[PDB]
Design an enzyme around this catalytic site. Structure first.
Site, PDB file in Angstrom:
ATOM      1  N   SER A   1      37.270  41.225  36.332  1.00 16.85           N
ATOM      2  CA  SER A   1      35.940  41.171  35.747  1.00 16.85           C
ATOM      3  C   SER A   1      34.912  40.702  36.778  1.00 16.85           C
ATOM      4  CB  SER A   1      35.946  40.285  34.494  1.00 16.85           C
ATOM      5  OG  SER A   1      36.493  39.012  34.775  1.00 16.85           O
TER       6      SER A   1
ATOM      7  N   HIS B   1      34.117  41.160  30.853  1.00 18.37           N
ATOM      8  CA  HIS B   1      35.361  40.405  30.820  1.00 18.37           C
ATOM      9  C   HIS B   1      36.605  41.238  31.051  1.00 18.37           C
ATOM     10  CE1 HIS B   1      37.237  41.717  26.992  1.00 18.37           C
ATOM     11  NE2 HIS B   1      35.993  42.032  26.677  1.00 18.37           N
ATOM     12  N   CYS B   2      37.658  40.546  31.459  1.00 17.03           N
ATOM     13  CA  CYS B   2      39.005  41.052  31.343  1.00 17.03           C
ATOM     14  C   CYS B   2      39.753  39.975  30.565  1.00 17.03           C
ATOM     15  CB  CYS B   2      39.622  41.297  32.721  1.00 17.03           C
ATOM     16  SG  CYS B   2      41.230  42.117  32.662  1.00 17.03           S
ATOM     17  N   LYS B   3      40.559  39.185  31.263  1.00 11.65           N
ATOM     18  CA  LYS B   3      41.283  38.085  30.628  1.00 11.65           C
ATOM     19  C   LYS B   3      40.655  36.731  30.936  1.00 11.65           C
ATOM     20  CE  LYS B   3      45.576  37.694  30.388  1.00 11.65           C
ATOM     21  NZ  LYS B   3      46.995  37.439  30.785  1.00 11.65           N
TER      22      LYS B   3
ATOM     23  N   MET C   1      37.598  45.225  30.172  1.00 13.73           N
ATOM     24  CA  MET C   1      38.517  45.767  31.155  1.00 13.73           C
ATOM     25  C   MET C   1      39.956  45.478  30.767  1.00 13.73           C
ATOM     26  SD  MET C   1      36.259  44.706  34.460  1.00 13.73           S
ATOM     27  CE  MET C   1      35.339  43.494  33.524  1.00 13.73           C
TER      28      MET C   1
END
EC number: 3.1.3.27
Length: 157
Positions: free
Chosen positions: A103, A95-97, A35
């Site tokens: 996420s 995931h994102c960050k 993401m």
């Protein structure tokens, strides 16, 4: 860095190039939902091709700017992607960050659909496993609409 949510889904911070081996062999990760892939941090992570090499398919999704959540349509895309791998008995890393919010929201949608759970049931389940889950009102409202759509699609069966 990441936590297993169930037999299919894992939720964690952005995956480092170096983690690839462990994720694929140990966690059976064959899919990844990425993401808001940011250009400033992509040197840390696999490209889509570096994922292919390791035998994992990457799905890239964007949040609706300022919302913290994709469109309903992309939420369904993410969930159907996870379900694709659930049917294969394989795993998906989401995931994102930081693995805490955007996420977390994606994983929430997955759980809502899989369990016919309320947004809050799903979120509380995620928070019981992984710390600092933060799903904002703006993100919760979309999960509410997703919940309504899931229910209505269920009544068609």
């Amino acid at each position: 860095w990441y936590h297993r949510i169930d037999h299919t889904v894992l939720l964690g911070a952005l995956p480092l190039k170096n983690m690839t081996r462990r994720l694929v062999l140990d966690e059976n990760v064959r899919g990844v939902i990425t993401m808001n892939e940011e250009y400033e941090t992509r040197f840390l992570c696999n490209t889509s091709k570096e994922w292919k090499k390791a035998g994992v398919e990457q799905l890239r999704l964007s949040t609706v700017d300022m919302t913290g959540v994709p469109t309903l349509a992309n939420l369904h895309k993410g969930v159907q992607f996870a379900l694709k791998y659930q049917a294969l008995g394989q795993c998906v890393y989401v995931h994102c960050k930081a693995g805490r919010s955007r996420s977390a929201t994606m994983v929430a949608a997955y759980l809502i659909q899989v369990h016919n759970w309320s947004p809050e049931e799903a979120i509380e389940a995620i928070a019981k496993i992984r710390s600092h889950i933060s799903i904002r009102p703006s993100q919760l409202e979309v999960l509410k609409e997703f919940h309504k759509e899931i229910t209505a699609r269920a009544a068609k069966n």
